[PDB]
Amino acid sequence: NEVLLSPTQHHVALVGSKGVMVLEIPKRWGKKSEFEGGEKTVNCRTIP
Amino acid sequence: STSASARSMCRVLDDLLKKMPMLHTGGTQTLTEFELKWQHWREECERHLQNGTFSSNVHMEAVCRVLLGDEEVLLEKRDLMTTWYHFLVSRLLFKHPTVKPTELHFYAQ
Amino acid sequence: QKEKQLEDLRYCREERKSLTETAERLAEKFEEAKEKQEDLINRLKRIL
Amino acid sequence: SRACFQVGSEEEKRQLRTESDGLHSFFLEIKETTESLRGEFSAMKIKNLEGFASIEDVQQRNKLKQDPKYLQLLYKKPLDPKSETQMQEIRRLNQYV
Amino acid sequence: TLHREMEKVKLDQKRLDQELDFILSQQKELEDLLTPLEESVKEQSGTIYL
């Protein structure tokens, strides 16, 4: 249904008429606006 | 304590041993309840073996496979399994919660 | 996810040998610094 | 029939778990080695500063030995760091023995 | 977790390498400054006052 962002800027929550799916997205700073200055091996899995 | 990644496996084994019923479940209580508890423990062991956590450690995997009912390790290491008397009593302890005389003789032969 | 984990493990295996190389480099540099300090301490003892 | 029963085999998962455990152990031992190394580097820097202070004091006393006022300075001074630390080490060794 | 740990380890190892290079430079400077002083103390030790 909708999406929400954590106030600490670290979690993205997909909310729908059945539950939420939380995903951990690190901060974007340095290099080409990548995670922690160039990182693509972070945890990118949804949790119910 | 000797290893570095077997504490969870040891805790799972201890939980399974605790779930395994003893004498306070049958004999002087209810044979049907004892058989139900034995079947529950057996199916819990099969579920824990088929979940996939027993993929590593060939020792504990073989132990869990023997605890189910498969005697492939016993047939392979029959030189250490003493004799067929102990083989039969092990089969009885494994897959025989209730023994029948005719069935006992059949399994013996 | 399996392909990503395999690529991450290959990158980690390469970084393992990279860190081992830099570790033996740091070890030889530390041995050089230790022998230099030992020579300096021996000279100071002979002076005093 | 299109839906597979499982993705991959247990051998791949076992290999991944063993590699992860080995990497964890290697990183832990490397962190411990680097901590010991940074402690040794701090000790070596402390020893280097001690040697610098020692050679500075040596140069100072060598320059002061060639002065006539050093005699009166030593006669008026009621203490001295060299004799102080010497008697300190002597008393420590004596009490230990 | 392994990636974060190895990144922190690499950063700490680079910092330690820089610190050890600075320490080795300081030790070389100390040795070069102490080399001419090893002969001055040997000559002053022979001066025995009566």
SS3 per residue for C1-48: CHHHHHHHHHHHHHHHHHHHHHHHHHHHHHHHHHHHHHHHHHHHHHHC
Q: Side by side, which strands form the sheet with A19-24? A: A2-5, A11-16, A19-24, A46-47
User: Which helix (DSSP H) or strand (DSSP E) does residue A46 occupy?
Assistant: strand A46-47
User: How far, in Å, are A32, C47, E40, E48 from residue E35 at the CA level?
Assistant: 52, 11, 10, 24
Residues 6+ apart with CB under 8 A from C46: E38
Residue with tokens 């605790």: B18
* C9 token code pair: 């493990």
Say how far apart CA A25 and CA A42 lie, in whole Å: 8
Chains C+B touching (3+ CB pairs under 8 Å): no
Question: Dihedral sign, CA of D69, D72, D77, D80?
Answer: positive
User: Cβ contacts of residue B35 below 8 Å, gap of 6+?
Assistant: B26, B97, B98
Q: Number of C-alpha atoms within 13 angstroms, CB side, residue B31?
A: 3
Rounded CA-CA distance B40/B34 in Å is: 10
Which tokens belong to D56?
């500075």
Interchain proximity C1–A45, CB inside 8 Å = yes
Using CA atoms, how far apart are residues B31 and D12, in angstroms rounded to an integer?
A: 44
Burial call B27-57: b when 16+ CB within 10 Å, e when fewer: eeeeeeebeebbeebbeebeebbeeeebbbb
Using CA of residue C34, residue E26, residue C47, residue D61, what is the dihedral sign? negative
Residues contacting A43, CB < 8 A, separation 6+: A24
**Cα of D9 to nearest chain C Cα, Å:** 12
Residues B22 and E15: their CA atoms lie apart, in Å, by 61
Considering only CA atoms, which of A14, A10, A12, A13 is closest in space to residue A35? A10
Q: For A13, phi and psi rounded to 5 degrees?
A: -115, 115
- The DSSP bridge partners found for residue A3 are A14
Distance, in Å, from the CA atom of E50 to the CA atom of E31, rounded to the nearest integer, reads: 35
**SS3 label, residue E38:** helix
Q: Which residues contact B26 (CB under 8 A, 6 or more apart)?
A: B33, B34, B35, B37
Distances (CA, A) of E10 to B75, C20, D64: 52, 11, 50
Tell me the C-alpha distance between B89 and D89, whole Å.
76
Q: β-pairing, A46-47 with A11-16?
A: unpaired
Counting beta carbons within 10 angstroms of the beta carbon of residue E7, is it exposed (0 to 12), middle (13 to 18) or buried (19 or more)?
Answer: middle
Is some CB atom of chain E closer than 8 A to the CB atom of A41?
yes
Contact call for C8 and A41, based on CB within 8 A: yes
- Helices D10-65 and E2-34, axial angle in degrees (round to 10): 20
Please say whether the beta carbons of C32 and E24 come within 8 A.
yes
Both tokens assigned to D49 = 């500063």
Chain A / chain C CB contacts < 8 angstroms: 4
* Structure token digits, residue E46: 């022979």
Q: Is A24 helix (H, G, I), strand (E, B) or coil?
A: strand
Interface of chain C against chain E, CB under 8 Å?
A: 8, 12, 15, 19, 22-23, 25-26, 29-30, 32-33, 36-37, 39-40, 43, 46-47
- Residue C38 to residues C42, C45, E21, Cα–Cα distance (Å): 6, 10, 17
Report DSSP state, residue B53: T
Within 8 A by CB and 6+ apart from C28, the residues are none
Q: Which long-range contacts (CB under 8 A, 24 or more apart) does B85-89 make?
A: none
Q: Where does A1-48 have alpha helices with state H? A: none
Which of D5, D11, D43 shows the shortest CA–CA distance to C30? D43
Residue carrying structure tokens 């060639």: D66
Give backbone dihedrals phi and psi of A23, rounded to 5 degrees, phi first.
Answer: -135, 135
| Cα of D52 to nearest chain E Cα, Å | 7
CA dist E27 → A42, D48, D59, D78, E33 (Å): 42, 7, 18, 36, 10
